[PDB]
Amino acid sequence: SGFRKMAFPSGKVEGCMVQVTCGTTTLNGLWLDDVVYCPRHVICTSEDMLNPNYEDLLIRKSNHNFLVQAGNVQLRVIGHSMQNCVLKLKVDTANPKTPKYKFVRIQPGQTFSVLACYNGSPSGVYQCAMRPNFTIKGSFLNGSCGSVGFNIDYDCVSFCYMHHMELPTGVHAGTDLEGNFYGPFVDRQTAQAAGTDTTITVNVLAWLYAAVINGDRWFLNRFTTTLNDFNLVAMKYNYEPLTQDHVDILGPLSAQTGIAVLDMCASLKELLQNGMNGRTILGSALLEDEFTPFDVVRQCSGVTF
Amino acid sequence: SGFRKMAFPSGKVEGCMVQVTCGTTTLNGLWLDDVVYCPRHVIPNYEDLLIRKSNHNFLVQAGNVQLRVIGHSMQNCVLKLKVDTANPKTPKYKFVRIQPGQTFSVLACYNGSPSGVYQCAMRPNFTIKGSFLNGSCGSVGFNIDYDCVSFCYMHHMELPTGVHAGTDLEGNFYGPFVDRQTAQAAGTDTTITVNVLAWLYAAVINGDRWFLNRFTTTLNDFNLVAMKYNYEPLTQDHVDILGPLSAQTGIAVLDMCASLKELLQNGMNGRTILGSALLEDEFTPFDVVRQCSGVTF
Ligand SMILES: CS(=O)(=O)NCc1ccc(Cl)cc1CC(=O)Nc1cncc2ccccc12
Ligand SMILES: CS(=O)(=O)NCc1ccc(Cl)cc1CC(=O)Nc1cncc2ccccc12
Numbered sequence: 001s002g003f004r005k006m007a008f009p010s011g012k013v014e015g016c017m018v019q020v021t022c023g024t025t026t027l028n029g030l031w032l033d034d035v036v037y038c039p040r041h042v043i044c045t046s047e048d049m050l051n052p053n054y055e056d057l058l059i060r061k062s063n064h065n066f067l068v069q070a071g072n073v074q075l076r077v078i079g080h081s082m083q084n085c086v087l088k089l090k091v092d093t094a095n096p097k098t099p100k101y102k103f104v105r106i107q108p109g110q111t112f113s114v115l116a117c118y119n120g121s122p123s124g125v126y127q128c129a130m131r132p133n134f135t136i137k138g139s140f141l142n143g144s145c146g147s148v149g150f151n152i153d154y155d156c157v158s159f160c161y162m163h164h165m166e167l168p169t170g171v172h173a174g175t176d177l178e179g180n181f182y183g184p185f186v187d188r189q190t191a192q193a194a195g196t197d198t199t200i201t202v203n204v205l206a207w208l209y210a211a212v213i214n215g216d217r218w219f220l221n222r223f224t225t226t227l228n229d230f231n232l233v234a235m236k237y238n239y240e241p242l243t244q245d246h247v248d249i250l251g252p253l254s255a256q257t258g259i260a261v262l263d264m265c266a267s268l269k270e271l272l273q274n275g276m277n278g279r280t281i282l283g284s285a286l287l288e289d290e291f292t293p294f295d296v297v298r299q300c301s302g303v304t305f
Numbered sequence: 306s307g308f309r310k311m312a313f314p315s316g317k318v319e320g321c322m323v324q325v326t327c328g329t330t331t332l333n334g335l336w337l338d339d340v341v342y343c344p345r346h347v348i349p350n351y352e353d354l355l356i357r358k359s360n361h362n363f364l365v366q367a368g369n370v371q372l373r374v375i376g377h378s379m380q381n382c383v384l385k386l387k388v389d390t391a392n393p394k395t396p397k398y399k400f401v402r403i404q405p406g407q408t409f410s411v412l413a414c415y416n417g418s419p420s421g422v423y424q425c426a427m428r429p430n431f432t433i434k435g436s437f438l439n440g441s442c443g444s445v446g447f448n449i450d451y452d453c454v455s456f457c458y459m460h461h462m463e464l465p466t467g468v469h470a471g472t473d474l475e476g477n478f479y480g481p482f483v484d485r486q487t488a489q490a491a492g493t494d495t496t497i498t499v500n501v502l503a504w505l506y507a508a509v510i511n512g513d514r515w516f517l518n519r520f521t522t523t524l525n526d527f528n529l530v531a532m533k534y535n536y537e538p539l540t541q542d543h544v545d546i547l548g549p550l551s552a553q554t555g556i557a558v559l560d561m562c563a564s565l566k567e568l569l570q571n572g573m574n575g576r577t578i579l580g581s582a583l584l585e586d587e588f589t590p591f592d593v594v595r596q597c598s599g600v601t602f
């Protein structure tokens with residue numbers, strides 16, 4: 001019993017964190033086999049950030065301009081290349097702690113664990129979701145650039161995010177491990193603002209199924225809804241549209257609890273209309289959207305209370 | 306910017322998790338040097354049950370390797386299994402007993418394999434609001450101070466309300482609980498006042514100031530009000546501990562207490578603080594300073 005915002009154990013990722021220094025800038029890098037991956041803005045000064053020409057800044061660098069530190073050991077850089085917004089530093093030592101891994105690009109709504117780091121040293125781990133507006137509501141200070149997001153389903157680490165910047169509203173933007181940004185963002189100091197964010201509907205429904213599994217039904221009602229009527233109501237509360245893919249994905253949780261997806265949708269419509277009236281759902285007075293259907297199945301019991 | 310329920314990096318603890326099996330029961334153990342620590346209920350009159358067991362009755366698995374048990378002893382509610390192999394991954398560590406209101410990270414494990422990490426607090430009623438299923442027994446709670454892991458909790462049981470109970474690593478339970486199937490219930494819980502105040506300071510550091518007001522209060526008047534809402538009493542030690550956050554934000558502790566009083570008496574009025582519509586009490590003053598400063602391990 002219980003339901004917590006649970007992160008994956010971070011040990012496999014901790015063994016990959018290194019410090020990358022280029023001139024006066026110091027940030028984090030991810031050391032996998034003989035390559036260190038880090039944000040390409042490590043080669044920039046603060047002046048450079050308005051309109052940086054990364055190709056021009058990089059051509060002026062040699063391998064020995066990049067200092068890479070792994071624990072108390074200095075790694076030797078023997079090659080460098082840029083792939084989109086990521087710099088790849090070839091080093092002369094393969095990481096003996098390299099776990100089984102993959103680079104995966106995630107979609108809005110997907111969750112992942114973040115290992116926040118400073119100076120190549122891990123400080124904390126938390127769980128978060130890729131928002132519909134492609135930002136993440138992280139907890140990051142200056143020096144956290146290069147910190148990574150990941151999932152560890154089975155024994156394989158799937159790296160999905162690398163931290164690049166904080167937007168004016170305090171939210172965060174970054175790339176996949178191939179250097180492609182999530183969202184319409186650029187690694188440039190320009191007028192960039194997060195688009196209006198929305199609630200991840202399929203995740204709120206998954207979390208309502210989690211509450212039913214753990215023994216709570218106060219929010220259910222005798223009604224059902226069509227998918228279209230639910231979406232017309234949901235969009236008035238800034239909720240993301242629910243698609244047939246989302247309905248199909250909630251199938252297993254629907255069969256485990258005996259509550260049809262459109263019946264759970266009707267309960268969500270009523271909660272949006274009434275609020276909680278002094279009650280909580282899984283210890284929260286707000287509707288939680290940072291647990292996916294997959295997270296609920298992983299954390300919750302297979303037997304409903 | 307941002308404020309998350311952040312756990313310590315779990316790698317140093319992951320390298321200590323093992324599976325302990327005794328007959329039909331399988332649970333988790335903590336392997337430090339040549340000893341495996343686990344709940345004694347893996348085997349009631351525990352001395353009588355233990356005397357009937359030999360070393361080979363305990364099966365200890367570390368990854369894909371079977372460890373050989375060469376000795377066994379009981380310390381309070383923890384069983385200590387002496388193994389032939391010292392854990393090469395043993396970190397620098399201490400066993401520490403924590404107090405209600407203090408927080409820690411939990412590495413939830415099943416079959417000696419870590420599945421997740423989350424942050425939680427020892428409630429005033431000595432239970433923890435964890436997330437555990439059958440097989441989680443032996444999972445541990447810890448903090449990291451510099452490069453040293455301070456083990457503070459070992460999971461033993463779930464109570465009827467869905468909350469959890471366990472011991473320190475010396476086998477002493479937190480709370481009036483016993484390790485057996487009998488009628489046990491968590492006492493009425495209270496809110497950790499010093500932690501709510503620390504979280505209000507974290508919200509101010511992050512730009513959330515709508516709840517600040519021009520008023521102050523005496524410590525006695527605040528405690529009379531706090532007692533009415535099932536909040537733990539605030540002591541002068543708590544006021545002293547909040548000193549640094551008070552100097553950083555410019556808001557006196559009793560000034561923040563007057564904000565907390567108004568929130569208790571009137572509610573949030575449709576507003577949120579750090580994305581929450583409830584007053585959060587599972588961040589200590591030290592957790593706030595660490596997360597708003599970047600301390601690494
Ligand atoms: C150097 S500048 O032109 O003033 N702007 C910095 C900058 C521009 C464009 C990019 Cl892609 C990256 C940066 C650096 C950057 O945003 N760092 C940070 C990352 N995460 C959290 C932070 C919290 C507080 C301060 C900085 C933080
Ligand atoms: C095993 S028994 O003696 O029959 N009764 C249970 C019991 C009594 C006394 C003790 Cl010290 C331990 C137990 C077992 C126990 O509480 N396990 C669990 C721990 N955490 C989460 C759980 C979720 C679902 C089921 C069990 C869970």
Ligand SMILES: [Cl-]
Pocket residue numbers: 105106107110
């Ligand atoms: Cl995805």
